[PDB]
């Protein structure tokens, strides 16, 4: 049984977000960032139980549904406004080389035939993609640190990272790189 305590709160959070979402489309979707293309590792953190329908399509687009997942994205003028919608449920920050290389090595999962298999062999890598210029995991590792045209498939190949929940360890520029070390 659920109380009228939660009903008023849920409708208050919904009108606050709808105003902020309709703030965002009505205003110009421009961020105070240089136009040079950069890379973001972005992590879903549970903001509110109910969810609005424009982020519903775009969170399925980032396949970011389960609790405490992460994925690597590349910022454009498009991808910024995708990020500039989904702020309260996600954390965005620039990765470092030690953080990215560990995360895939500790937790590396790939997608073939709708299955979540680990990353056990580099022969599996060539059986999966093969003809895209990649030769091992380190080829994908280099592809993350400097974005190439084939990063679109490498993001599609890579499963979302199911990290562990930390026990207490909007924008944060280096604090998310502290958050990966606390919760990996």
């Amino acid at each position: 049984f659920k109380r009228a305590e939660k009903y008023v709160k849920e409708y208050r959070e919904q009108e606050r977000e709808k105003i902020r979402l309709a703030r965002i489309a009505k205003q110009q979707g421009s961020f105070h960032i240089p136009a040079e293309a950069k890379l973001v590792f972005v992590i879903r953190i549970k903001g509110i139980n109910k969810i609005p329908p424009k982020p519903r399509k775009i969170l399925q687009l980032l396949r970011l549904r389960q609790i405490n997942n992460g994925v690597f994205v590349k910022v454009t003028k498009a991808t910024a406004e995708m990020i500039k919608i989904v702020e309260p449920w996600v954390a965005y920050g620039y990765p470092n080389l030690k953080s990215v290389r560990e995360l895939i090595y500790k937790r590396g999962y790939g997608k073939v035939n709708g299955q979540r298999i680990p990353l056990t062999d580099n022969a599996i890598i060539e059986e999966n993609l093969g003809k895209y210029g990649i030769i091992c995991i380190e080829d994908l590792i280099h592809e993350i640190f400097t974005v190439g045209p084939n990063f679109k498939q490498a993001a599609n190949f890579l499963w979302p990272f199911k990290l562990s929940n930390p026990n207490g360890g909007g924008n944060r520029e280096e604090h998310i790189n502290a958050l990966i070390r606390a919760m990996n």
């Binding site: 470092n96 080389l97 030690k98 290389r101 790189n177």
Partner: peptide, 22 residues
């Protein structure tokens, strides 16, 4: 002694500097 900035940047074996005398 070691540098956290070098270790974070990925020095691994390179961040650890060893001094012969105390």
């Amino acid at each position: 002694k070691f540098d956290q900035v070098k270790d974070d940047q990925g020095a691994e074996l390179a961040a650890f500097s060893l001094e012969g005398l105390n």
